[PDB]
Design a protein around this ligand. Sequence first.
Ligand SMILES: Nc1nc(Nc2ccc(S(N)(=O)=O)cc2)sc1C(=O)c1ccc(S(N)(=O)=O)cc1
Length: 294
Amino acid sequence: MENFQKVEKIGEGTYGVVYKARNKLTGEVVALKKIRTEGVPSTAIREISLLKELNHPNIVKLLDVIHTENKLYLVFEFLHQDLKKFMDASALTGIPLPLIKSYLFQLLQGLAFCHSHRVLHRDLKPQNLLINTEGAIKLADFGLARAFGVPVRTYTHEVVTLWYRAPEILLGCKYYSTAVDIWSLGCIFAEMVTRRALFPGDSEIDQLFRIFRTLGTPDEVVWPGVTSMPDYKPSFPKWARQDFSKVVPPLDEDGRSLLSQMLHYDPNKRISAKAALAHPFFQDVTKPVPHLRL
Ligand SMILES: Nc1nc(Nc2ccc(S(N)(=O)=O)cc2)sc1C(=O)c1ccc(S(N)(=O)=O)cc1
Protein backbone atom coordinates (compact mmCIF):
# COMPACT_ATOMS: atom_id res chain seq x y z
CA MET A 1 0.00 0.00 0.00
CA GLU A 2 0.94 3.65 -0.43
CA ASN A 3 0.40 4.24 3.28
CA PHE A 4 3.21 1.83 4.12
CA GLN A 5 6.94 1.67 3.65
CA LYS A 6 8.25 -1.85 3.08
CA VAL A 7 11.22 -2.36 5.37
CA GLU A 8 12.06 -5.97 4.53
CA LYS A 9 10.42 -9.17 3.35
CA ILE A 10 9.94 -11.48 6.33
CA GLY A 11 8.21 -14.66 5.22
CA GLU A 12 6.82 -16.39 2.15
CA GLY A 13 3.69 -17.83 3.72
CA THR A 14 1.12 -19.69 1.66
CA TYR A 15 -1.30 -17.38 -0.16
CA GLY A 16 0.97 -14.39 0.38
CA VAL A 17 4.25 -12.78 1.35
CA VAL A 18 4.83 -11.13 4.71
CA TYR A 19 6.68 -7.85 5.06
CA LYS A 20 7.92 -5.74 7.92
CA ALA A 21 6.57 -2.25 7.20
CA ARG A 22 6.10 1.20 8.73
CA ASN A 23 2.82 3.12 8.76
CA LYS A 24 3.90 6.30 6.95
CA LEU A 25 1.09 8.02 8.82
CA THR A 26 1.60 6.79 12.40
CA GLY A 27 5.16 5.53 12.07
CA GLU A 28 4.07 2.34 13.80
CA VAL A 29 5.95 -0.79 12.73
CA VAL A 30 3.79 -3.74 11.62
CA ALA A 31 3.87 -7.09 9.87
CA LEU A 32 1.98 -6.82 6.59
CA LYS A 33 0.67 -9.83 4.67
CA LYS A 34 -0.24 -9.31 1.01
CA ILE A 35 -2.57 -11.79 -0.66
CA ARG A 36 -3.30 -12.27 -4.36
CA THR A 37 -8.22 -15.69 -12.23
CA GLU A 38 -10.91 -13.79 -10.36
CA GLY A 39 -14.18 -14.12 -8.47
CA VAL A 40 -13.87 -12.07 -5.27
CA PRO A 41 -13.72 -14.31 -2.15
CA SER A 42 -16.30 -12.18 -0.32
CA THR A 43 -17.14 -15.06 2.06
CA ALA A 44 -13.51 -15.75 2.95
CA ILE A 45 -12.90 -12.04 3.41
CA ARG A 46 -15.82 -11.88 5.87
CA GLU A 47 -14.32 -14.66 7.98
CA ILE A 48 -10.84 -13.15 7.97
CA SER A 49 -12.39 -9.87 9.10
CA LEU A 50 -14.08 -11.59 12.05
CA LEU A 51 -10.63 -12.47 13.41
CA LYS A 52 -10.09 -8.77 14.19
CA GLU A 53 -12.17 -9.20 17.35
CA LEU A 54 -9.84 -11.96 18.57
CA ASN A 55 -8.13 -10.20 21.49
CA HIS A 56 -5.83 -12.23 23.76
CA PRO A 57 -2.26 -11.77 25.07
CA ASN A 58 -1.20 -14.94 23.24
CA ILE A 59 -2.75 -14.14 19.87
CA VAL A 60 -1.05 -11.73 17.43
CA LYS A 61 -3.41 -8.76 17.04
CA LEU A 62 -4.90 -8.35 13.56
CA LEU A 63 -5.05 -4.57 13.20
CA ASP A 64 -6.72 -4.28 9.78
CA VAL A 65 -8.01 -6.21 6.79
CA ILE A 66 -7.81 -4.10 3.61
CA HIS A 67 -9.43 -5.25 0.37
CA THR A 68 -8.33 -3.10 -2.55
CA GLU A 69 -6.92 -3.29 -6.07
CA ASN A 70 -7.63 -7.03 -6.36
CA LYS A 71 -5.33 -7.54 -3.37
CA LEU A 72 -5.98 -8.39 0.27
CA TYR A 73 -3.77 -6.87 2.96
CA LEU A 74 -3.70 -8.08 6.55
CA VAL A 75 -2.01 -5.71 9.00
CA PHE A 76 -0.66 -7.30 12.18
CA GLU A 77 1.13 -6.02 15.25
CA PHE A 78 4.83 -6.78 14.71
CA LEU A 79 6.88 -9.19 16.87
CA HIS A 80 10.66 -9.55 16.44
CA GLN A 81 11.31 -13.24 16.01
CA ASP A 82 9.48 -16.48 15.27
CA LEU A 83 9.93 -19.78 17.09
CA LYS A 84 11.58 -21.38 14.06
CA LYS A 85 14.48 -18.93 14.20
CA PHE A 86 14.68 -19.14 17.99
CA MET A 87 14.81 -22.95 17.89
CA ASP A 88 17.49 -22.81 15.21
CA ALA A 89 19.44 -20.30 17.29
CA SER A 90 19.06 -22.55 20.32
CA ALA A 91 20.08 -25.73 18.47
CA LEU A 92 23.48 -26.04 20.16
CA THR A 93 22.24 -25.55 23.71
CA GLY A 94 18.55 -26.30 23.47
CA ILE A 95 15.79 -24.13 24.95
CA PRO A 96 15.68 -24.26 28.76
CA LEU A 97 12.88 -26.54 29.96
CA PRO A 98 11.34 -23.75 32.02
CA LEU A 99 11.09 -21.64 28.88
CA ILE A 100 9.72 -24.54 26.83
CA LYS A 101 7.15 -25.06 29.55
CA SER A 102 6.23 -21.36 29.66
CA TYR A 103 5.77 -21.20 25.88
CA LEU A 104 3.65 -24.37 25.78
CA PHE A 105 1.48 -23.05 28.63
CA GLN A 106 0.93 -19.67 26.92
CA LEU A 107 0.10 -21.27 23.58
CA LEU A 108 -2.46 -23.56 25.25
CA GLN A 109 -3.98 -20.47 26.87
CA GLY A 110 -4.19 -18.93 23.43
CA LEU A 111 -5.82 -22.04 21.94
CA ALA A 112 -8.17 -22.44 24.91
CA PHE A 113 -9.30 -18.90 24.12
CA CYS A 114 -9.80 -19.15 20.38
CA HIS A 115 -11.34 -22.61 20.68
CA SER A 116 -13.92 -21.35 23.21
CA HIS A 117 -14.78 -18.78 20.51
CA ARG A 118 -15.13 -21.56 17.93
CA VAL A 119 -12.02 -20.42 16.05
CA LEU A 120 -9.47 -22.94 14.79
CA HIS A 121 -5.97 -22.09 13.70
CA ARG A 122 -5.50 -25.08 11.33
CA ASP A 123 -1.85 -24.57 10.49
CA LEU A 124 0.22 -24.24 13.64
CA LYS A 125 3.95 -24.48 12.96
CA PRO A 126 7.04 -22.73 14.40
CA GLN A 127 6.90 -20.01 11.71
CA ASN A 128 3.42 -19.05 12.94
CA LEU A 129 4.53 -18.70 16.58
CA LEU A 130 6.06 -15.33 17.42
CA ILE A 131 8.05 -14.25 20.47
CA ASN A 132 9.10 -10.97 22.07
CA THR A 133 11.80 -9.94 24.53
CA GLU A 134 9.30 -10.01 27.43
CA GLY A 135 8.95 -13.79 27.43
CA ALA A 136 5.60 -13.88 25.64
CA ILE A 137 4.78 -16.14 22.67
CA LYS A 138 1.80 -15.63 20.35
CA LEU A 139 -0.29 -17.46 17.75
CA ALA A 140 -0.04 -15.81 14.30
CA ASP A 141 -1.83 -16.07 10.94
CA PHE A 142 -4.95 -18.14 11.68
CA GLY A 143 -5.95 -20.15 8.63
CA LEU A 144 -9.68 -20.80 8.91
CA ALA A 145 -9.27 -22.36 5.46
CA ARG A 146 -12.87 -23.39 6.04
CA ALA A 147 -13.41 -20.39 3.77
CA PHE A 148 -10.43 -19.99 1.42
CA GLY A 149 -9.36 -23.63 1.42
CA VAL A 150 -5.90 -24.74 0.25
CA PRO A 151 -4.55 -25.40 -3.33
CA VAL A 152 -1.03 -26.85 -3.46
CA ARG A 153 1.37 -23.93 -2.86
CA THR A 154 1.32 -20.30 -1.68
CA TYR A 155 0.05 -18.93 -5.00
CA THR A 156 3.30 -19.07 -6.98
CA HIS A 157 5.38 -22.21 -6.34
CA GLU A 158 6.73 -22.86 -2.83
CA VAL A 159 6.80 -26.01 -0.64
CA VAL A 160 4.36 -26.23 2.30
CA THR A 161 5.18 -28.07 5.53
CA LEU A 162 3.15 -31.15 6.49
CA TRP A 163 5.13 -31.89 9.65
CA TYR A 164 2.48 -30.67 12.10
CA ARG A 165 -0.62 -31.97 10.28
CA ALA A 166 -3.05 -34.04 12.39
CA PRO A 167 -3.68 -37.62 11.18
CA GLU A 168 -7.40 -37.06 10.64
CA ILE A 169 -6.60 -34.34 8.09
CA LEU A 170 -4.08 -36.60 6.33
CA LEU A 171 -6.77 -39.32 6.19
CA GLY A 172 -9.21 -36.94 4.48
CA CYS A 173 -11.62 -36.14 7.33
CA LYS A 174 -13.36 -33.05 5.80
CA TYR A 175 -14.54 -31.70 9.15
CA TYR A 176 -11.62 -30.66 11.36
CA SER A 177 -12.21 -30.15 15.06
CA THR A 178 -10.19 -28.05 17.49
CA ALA A 179 -8.23 -31.27 18.12
CA VAL A 180 -6.13 -30.63 15.01
CA ASP A 181 -4.53 -27.65 16.77
CA ILE A 182 -3.63 -29.70 19.84
CA TRP A 183 -1.91 -32.25 17.63
CA SER A 184 0.21 -29.60 15.85
CA LEU A 185 1.17 -28.06 19.19
CA GLY A 186 2.16 -31.47 20.56
CA CYS A 187 4.47 -31.88 17.56
CA ILE A 188 5.97 -28.45 18.27
CA PHE A 189 6.41 -29.25 21.98
CA ALA A 190 8.34 -32.41 21.03
CA GLU A 191 10.52 -30.46 18.63
CA MET A 192 11.40 -27.83 21.23
CA VAL A 193 12.45 -30.63 23.60
CA THR A 194 14.46 -32.81 21.24
CA ARG A 195 15.65 -30.12 18.82
CA ARG A 196 14.48 -32.37 15.98
CA ALA A 197 11.15 -32.28 14.09
CA LEU A 198 9.00 -35.14 15.42
CA PHE A 199 7.44 -36.24 12.11
CA PRO A 200 9.32 -34.72 9.19
CA GLY A 201 7.35 -36.09 6.27
CA ASP A 202 8.19 -35.04 2.71
CA SER A 203 4.81 -36.06 1.28
CA GLU A 204 1.35 -36.74 2.66
CA ILE A 205 1.85 -40.50 2.69
CA ASP A 206 5.37 -40.20 4.09
CA GLN A 207 3.96 -37.91 6.79
CA LEU A 208 1.21 -40.37 7.60
CA PHE A 209 3.60 -43.33 7.65
CA ARG A 210 6.15 -41.54 9.84
CA ILE A 211 3.31 -41.01 12.32
CA PHE A 212 2.36 -44.72 12.08
CA ARG A 213 5.93 -45.94 12.58
CA THR A 214 6.16 -44.03 15.85
CA LEU A 215 2.67 -44.23 17.32
CA GLY A 216 1.64 -47.52 15.76
CA THR A 217 -0.68 -47.96 12.77
CA PRO A 218 -4.10 -47.01 14.12
CA ASP A 219 -6.98 -49.50 14.21
CA GLU A 220 -10.61 -49.57 15.35
CA VAL A 221 -9.59 -50.31 18.92
CA VAL A 222 -7.63 -47.09 19.45
CA TRP A 223 -9.50 -44.98 16.87
CA PRO A 224 -13.10 -46.10 16.23
CA GLY A 225 -14.06 -45.28 12.67
CA VAL A 226 -10.51 -44.94 11.38
CA THR A 227 -10.91 -47.79 8.85
CA SER A 228 -13.86 -45.97 7.26
CA MET A 229 -12.01 -42.71 6.66
CA PRO A 230 -11.87 -41.26 3.10
CA ASP A 231 -8.18 -41.95 2.50
CA TYR A 232 -7.71 -44.95 4.76
CA LYS A 233 -6.37 -48.00 2.92
CA PRO A 234 -6.65 -51.56 4.30
CA SER A 235 -3.28 -51.95 2.63
CA PHE A 236 -1.52 -49.58 5.05
CA PRO A 237 1.46 -51.32 6.65
CA LYS A 238 0.89 -52.36 10.25
CA TRP A 239 3.56 -50.90 12.51
CA ALA A 240 3.65 -51.56 16.25
CA ARG A 241 3.71 -48.55 18.57
CA GLN A 242 7.13 -47.52 19.83
CA ASP A 243 7.89 -46.99 23.49
CA PHE A 244 7.34 -43.33 24.28
CA SER A 245 10.49 -42.95 26.41
CA LYS A 246 12.32 -43.25 23.11
CA VAL A 247 10.31 -40.43 21.48
CA VAL A 248 11.15 -37.41 23.64
CA PRO A 249 14.14 -38.17 25.83
CA PRO A 250 14.96 -36.63 28.28
CA LEU A 251 11.52 -35.11 28.87
CA ASP A 252 10.22 -36.06 32.36
CA GLU A 253 7.17 -38.31 32.89
CA ASP A 254 4.78 -35.39 33.43
CA GLY A 255 5.90 -34.01 30.10
CA ARG A 256 5.69 -37.37 28.33
CA SER A 257 2.26 -37.96 29.83
CA LEU A 258 0.98 -34.63 28.54
CA LEU A 259 2.51 -35.17 25.12
CA SER A 260 0.91 -38.57 24.82
CA GLN A 261 -2.52 -37.04 25.44
CA MET A 262 -1.90 -34.33 22.84
CA LEU A 263 -1.01 -37.05 20.36
CA HIS A 264 -3.97 -39.46 20.76
CA TYR A 265 -5.14 -40.68 17.38
CA ASP A 266 -8.83 -40.32 18.16
CA PRO A 267 -9.78 -36.60 17.96
CA ASN A 268 -12.34 -37.28 20.69
CA LYS A 269 -9.72 -38.71 23.04
CA ARG A 270 -7.09 -36.05 22.32
CA ILE A 271 -6.79 -33.63 25.24
CA SER A 272 -8.43 -30.17 24.95
CA ALA A 273 -6.42 -26.98 25.48
CA LYS A 274 -8.43 -26.24 28.63
CA ALA A 275 -7.72 -29.67 30.15
CA ALA A 276 -4.07 -29.54 29.14
CA LEU A 277 -3.66 -26.32 31.12
CA ALA A 278 -4.58 -28.29 34.23
CA HIS A 279 -2.08 -31.11 33.59
CA PRO A 280 0.44 -31.63 36.41
CA PHE A 281 3.25 -30.82 33.99
CA PHE A 282 2.38 -27.15 34.61
CA GLN A 283 2.48 -27.35 38.39
CA ASP A 284 5.77 -25.40 38.52
CA VAL A 285 5.36 -23.23 35.41
CA THR A 286 7.00 -19.80 35.48
CA LYS A 287 7.64 -17.05 32.91
CA PRO A 288 11.37 -16.85 32.08
CA VAL A 289 12.72 -14.16 29.76
CA PRO A 290 14.45 -15.52 26.65
CA HIS A 291 17.89 -14.51 25.44
CA LEU A 292 16.97 -13.04 22.07
CA ARG A 293 19.47 -11.88 19.46
CA LEU A 294 17.68 -9.39 17.19
N1 LIG B 1 3.15 -10.48 13.45
C1 LIG B 1 4.16 -10.94 12.83
N2 LIG B 1 5.44 -10.52 13.13
C2 LIG B 1 6.30 -11.12 12.37
N3 LIG B 1 7.56 -10.84 12.51
C3 LIG B 1 8.61 -11.58 12.33
C4 LIG B 1 9.88 -11.00 12.64
C5 LIG B 1 11.06 -11.76 12.48
C6 LIG B 1 10.97 -13.10 12.01
S1 LIG B 1 12.43 -14.06 11.84
N4 LIG B 1 12.26 -15.20 10.63
O1 LIG B 1 12.63 -14.74 13.09
O2 LIG B 1 13.56 -13.18 11.58
C7 LIG B 1 9.73 -13.68 11.71
C8 LIG B 1 8.55 -12.93 11.86
S2 LIG B 1 5.63 -12.26 11.24
C9 LIG B 1 4.06 -11.90 11.82
C10 LIG B 1 2.86 -12.47 11.37
O3 LIG B 1 1.80 -12.09 11.81
C11 LIG B 1 2.87 -13.50 10.44
C12 LIG B 1 2.02 -13.41 9.29
C13 LIG B 1 2.02 -14.45 8.34
C14 LIG B 1 2.85 -15.59 8.52
S3 LIG B 1 2.83 -16.90 7.30
N5 LIG B 1 1.76 -18.10 7.81
O4 LIG B 1 4.16 -17.45 7.15
O5 LIG B 1 2.37 -16.33 6.05
C15 LIG B 1 3.69 -15.69 9.65
C16 LIG B 1 3.70 -14.65 10.61
